[PDB]
């Protein structure tokens, strides 16, 4: 077989995004998660049909689901969709 996405690879990607790319995760919550007044956000998991985020705002916290348009077959699909969603979201606030 081809190599699939796994829970261990998901965890490696989520930690690298939370350590160094936290600003991008707050943008995903605002543009694709329909949240307002986001103070920060973190990736709890990524899976073949979407990702789960923890979102802080107005002194409170909540968890939300963002669904992908097409299923992910492997970690290269995951890498590509995270970069495409960030390019679209930067465009919203800079138009």
């Amino acid at each position: 077989m081809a190599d699939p996405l796994t829970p261990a690879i998901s965890d490696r990607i989520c930690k690298h995004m939370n350590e160094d790319h936290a600003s991008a995760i707050a943008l995903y919550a605002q543009v694709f998660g329909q949240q307002t007044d986001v103070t920060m956000a973190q990736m709890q998991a990524i899976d073949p049909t979407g990702m789960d985020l923890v979102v802080e705002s107005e002194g409170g916290s909540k968890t939300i689901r963002i669904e992908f348009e097409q299923p992910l077959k492997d970690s290269e699909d995951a890498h590509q969709v995270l970069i495409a969603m960030a390019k679209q979201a930067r465009s919203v606030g800079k138009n």
Binding site: A86, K87, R90
Partner: peptide
């Protein structure tokens, strides 16, 4: 804000 291609498109 930083564009992702600044570190992820090597050309």
């Amino acid at each position: 804000v930083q564009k992702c291609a600044q570190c992820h498109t090597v050309q």
